Amino acid sequence: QYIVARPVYSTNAFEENHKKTGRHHHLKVCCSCSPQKAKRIVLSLFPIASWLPAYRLKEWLLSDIVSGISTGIVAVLQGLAFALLVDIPPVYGLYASFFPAIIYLFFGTSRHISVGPFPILSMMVGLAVSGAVSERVRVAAAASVTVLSGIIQLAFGILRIGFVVIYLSESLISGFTTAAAVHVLVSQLKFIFQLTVPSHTDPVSIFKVLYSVFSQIEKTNIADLVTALIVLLVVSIVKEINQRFKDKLPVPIPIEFIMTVIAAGVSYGCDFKNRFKVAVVGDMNPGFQPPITPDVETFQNTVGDCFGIAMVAFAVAFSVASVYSLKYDYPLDGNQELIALGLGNIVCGVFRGFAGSTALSRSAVQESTGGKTQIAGLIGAIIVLIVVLAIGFLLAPLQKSVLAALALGNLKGMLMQFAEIGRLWRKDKYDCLIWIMTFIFTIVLGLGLGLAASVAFQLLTIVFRTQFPKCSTLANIGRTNIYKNKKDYYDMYEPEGVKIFRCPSPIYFANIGFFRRKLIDAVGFSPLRILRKRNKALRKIRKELDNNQIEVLDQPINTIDWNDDLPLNIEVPKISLHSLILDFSAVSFLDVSSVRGLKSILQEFIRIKVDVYIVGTDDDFIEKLNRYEFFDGEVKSSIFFLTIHDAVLHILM
Amino acid sequence: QYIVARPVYSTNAFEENHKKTGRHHHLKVCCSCSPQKAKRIVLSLFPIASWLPAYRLKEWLLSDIVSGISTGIVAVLQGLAFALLVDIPPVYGLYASFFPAIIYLFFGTSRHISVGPFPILSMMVGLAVSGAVSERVRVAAAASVTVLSGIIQLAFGILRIGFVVIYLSESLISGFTTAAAVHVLVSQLKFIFQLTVPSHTDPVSIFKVLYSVFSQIEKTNIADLVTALIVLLVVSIVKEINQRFKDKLPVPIPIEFIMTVIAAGVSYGCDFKNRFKVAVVGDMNPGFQPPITPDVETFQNTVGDCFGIAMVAFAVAFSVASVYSLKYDYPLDGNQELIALGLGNIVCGVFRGFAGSTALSRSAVQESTGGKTQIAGLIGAIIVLIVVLAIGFLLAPLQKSVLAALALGNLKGMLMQFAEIGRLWRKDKYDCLIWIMTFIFTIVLGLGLGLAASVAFQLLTIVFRTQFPKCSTLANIGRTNIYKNKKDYYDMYEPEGVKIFRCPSPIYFANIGFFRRKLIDAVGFSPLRILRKRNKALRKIRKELDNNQIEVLDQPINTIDWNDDLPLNIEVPKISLHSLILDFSAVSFLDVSSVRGLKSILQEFIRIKVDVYIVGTDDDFIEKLNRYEFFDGEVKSSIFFLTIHDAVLHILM
């Protein structure tokens, strides 16, 4: 059974019978050079010196040839299809899937990540250029939003503050990216229907596009729509074949290559360019561009949106890479992800590309084909190299909506997150409000400002959880040490005069007005009204008054018991209370707005000659109240006890 | 002593031995007319029917004559001195201390409040007009910011959401009003030095004024500065006499009247207007103005700042009135303060005034002179009535910096709050960061936008408090039920295999990545690395692999004990752990981002054949985990226990 025979401990009669350890509680141990300290700094800022000299060549090379080619053809056709969401020339989407792939080979700490562009940052870059102009003024201003968002990411992995991704819950991540998969689905209607839409901008940007597209819906094309519904149907159902047959199917079907060759083959020979009037990708010039210096007139007016691109490029890079970090069991450094993607978006921004990070629909192509290391991300950048230099004379008959339909086949994973009202409403109803208020703020205020006002509302639902706590009143079940809520069981014996209270929440500025109101409700009387009625009855003994003298009615009584008949017609109220336990077990923290309100209600309750105890606090909660100066000659330190049946056994003896 | 002899209860063997009450857990009880329901609705929306028919005429009339006159002369001279902070004609400061004083007599629930203008809302109105223009275009646009901020206040006391004032701690209130007492001290330099400064606006508005004042500092006046230093010296030290001699001095010295009569007497007879060149208050026209209709072109561009004036006019009205509510012991309704000040700022905004609420330096004049009810706020509006109609031909020789020095004598109470770095740094250091980040955001971003970015940072210091909690590991002290931290005492016996953990914080999105990291640190091993090494050793028994087949290595084992020698060269690691208690006593709440991470680490720890218990949770914490579907055929409901010595007594038997 359960037998205890210890004496009654009062947390100051416990720290004298049982001595503490008295153990000692920065700028010398860290700022100190050592031959064993700078070894693991250089091999942690440059981690290619930790997987390249240990490379299993017989086992990992042939899996990294066939999985670097299979993500090379995906990186080309996704690269051209994301340069159109920014409305720059399409060759600038192959300078953004090659230059971050070389830099992340050296400084990168993840091993199953294919780095390039991805459609949530082809719009946040695409909406920042329209907010920095007001194609030569858009190429040179999309490659200066990249350098600004690569300096902010580099100056966050140097200050070692790469724990910012914990401020984004899964309801805020599955609410933002579901609303970002509608902005992608809407802004890819300029290229399927072949309509000339102006570049909209500020708030409510999706309904400005839907008003401009559907006002020209009689001017669409039939040779540009039946080839974006044949492509959208086949590459969806063949991708349905692959994820249904992940077994019994080695090296699954590359539908993103064999559909383009059909579509670029039919457009050269049936002459879709001059028979119909369909837009095609132009003739790209073979070769790179000279580097450019970013201008300050682009930095000044879009400094508020490169704090949005720099915290979206990392929150996708740390959500995707942590999927393969718990699957293949290797440690992942969250600050090396900020340096290797701060240097990727500076080199690719200087060399005229645009911003980007890892894509979930491309990293799963590298991971499922058999990519073991980031050598499959190097050979996935030799094929983007040979397309730029050598074979760029192909992909000119590509029909500019085969590209705009391949980027709509990837929106199955990000639009099936709508079945979270069907789950979070039945479960939480606070994290179903963060899903709704993120889907509304993003689709109205835009992508960039829909994350500032959604994180700030996500922090209002920690205050809403602990604003009106369920304050209780406890009682004893079975003459033992079990103290549970009084309105729940049957034989609960609460003793004579004792009134156990319980606040199951941390007490702070949003919580002390409710705890003080509920304590004087669940005790029967207010303690300040009965101090003033006693002092009025004491002044009548020694014998009303105006203002500035009511301050003497709240003084402590200095002389009777105030419970029997007073010898004149005096009607001061009586109380049966003579103790008040407080269960501070579930209280996590106090602050200076809650200590000054708790000290106020312990001082009223003591001057009525009601002994107030506080019960359940650990070692750190009492050692912090020594620093608020909570204790004085009235509120002693012998009011703290250990457990509830410890304090009640002290009252009855 | 302390003896217990109960059996061991496991919170499901407790709710069968002790039956619950099964008690039942809105639109019918409230939406129901009744002859006893509409009585206390009409007498609570119109509370002059609850103190006027019970008025002690012999005791409260002569204290309300002499304390309505003493706040009448203050309301006139403060009214003219706050119409200059908005830069309108000075007669429009007597239409703002008279019309809110009549409406608050009827609908007002406080009894020691003098209603008028006050210098923090003569600048928030004064900076909104400069943001709505870009004197006839400033009079008609300061009386439309008033009507917009009176409709927002009326539509917050009708929706019954007047608990918004709990989102503002005392560190955010003593940080905002200290920074608002520097904006007042700076913007009263246009009238002491007699300098013509253009109307400024947007961010960094105090340094734009200090640059414009001190660039003309050779063009000041000597007849306008020696009369704002004689006035500023005497009315400060005589107000030092009153608060030093609150006893032995009945009806304290009205220095704000006897100094003006001297200053308006010397300016008529020594001829300060034509000898020197000093600015004076003009000749006010006797009478009111016709009402105006607010234009929509003022409503559209300043809808973002009348959400700042409407939540500053209430946070001063509920901070001042709660001082006299706990002193004179009457209940104060926080929603009737929003209706009676929503109707005050509509009537006074239609009749060409400006916005306002109660002032701390004027309500203390009414309260200390002997004002008992709001009849002293009616006679304090008959004297503002006779100054407008009859004796407005006086106060024309008033020198416009006697008025600008009387409003600098009130900044002693709001500038002595700078000694809170000397208190909050030694005590809290989180609520000393809210004092600093509010003083910086207000003095840089302005008054209106310095409260949006200071409340939003105040909610980041509840996340900073519970981001890195002090996770512990407990042990037994003296073979009893006392379980405290292991690195604190000496004879702490932790049993064989048991590993008691403790998280002293609510677990949520900012807390589950740290609790999972600290649990596998304070247990010795990771539980997922040792599940995969067992399954690799089991496949070698029945006999590496590529991707999409590593998902079978995290499966539960289905067949040995994995603690002795395996019959081949197999080096799966061993564990001594066979239990894991978790102290969830201090855990307040869980959410869907923390349940999905806690369920993940209970499922890894059970498949290693390690029995995981969760200990310390009340009745409501288990009844919410039935709604997250935390329980299945693996994580049962018999893992919850009552207390720590209850679970450890179950392990050892």
UniProtKB/Swiss-Prot annotation, chains A, B:
Catalytic activity, reaction form: hydrogencarbonate(in) + 2 chloride(out) = hydrogencarbonate(out) + 2 chloride(in)
Record keyword Acetylation present: no
Topological region Extracellular: 86-87, 182-220, 327-337, 396-432
CDD domains noted in UniProt: STAS_SulP_like_sulfate_transporter (cd07042)
Post-translational modification: N-glycosylation is required for efficient cell surface expression, and protection from proteolytic degradation.
Membrane topology listed for this record: Multi-pass membrane protein
Ranges facing Cytoplasmic side: 1-64, 109-112, 160, 242-305, 359-374, 454-632
Keyword set, alphabetical order: Antiport, Cell membrane, Chloride, Disease variant, Glycoprotein, Membrane, Transmembrane, Transmembrane helix, Transport
Subcellular location(s) per record: Apical cell membrane; Membrane; Cell membrane
Tissue: Expressed in the colon. Expression is significantly decreased in adenomas (polyps) and adenocarcinomas of the colon.
A single Gene Ontology CC term: brush border membrane
Modes of activity regulation: Inhibited by acidic pH.
Residue span(s) of domain STAS: 488-651
Subunit-structure text: Interacts with CFTR, SLC26A6 and NHERF1. Interacts with PDZK1. Interacts (via PDZ-binding motif) with NHERF4 (via the third PDZ domain); interaction leads to decreased expression of SLC26A3 on the cell membrane resulting in its reduced exchanger activity.
Protein role: Mediates chloride-bicarbonate exchange with a chloride bicarbonate stoichiometry of 2:1 in the intestinal epithelia. Plays a role in the chloride and bicarbonate homeostasis during sperm epididymal maturation and capacitation.
NCBIfam families in alphabetical order: sulP
Family label: Belongs to the SLC26A/SulP transporter (TC 2.A.53) family.
Name of the protein in its database record: Chloride anion exchanger
Native source organism of the sequence: Homo sapiens
Gene name as annotated: SLC26A3
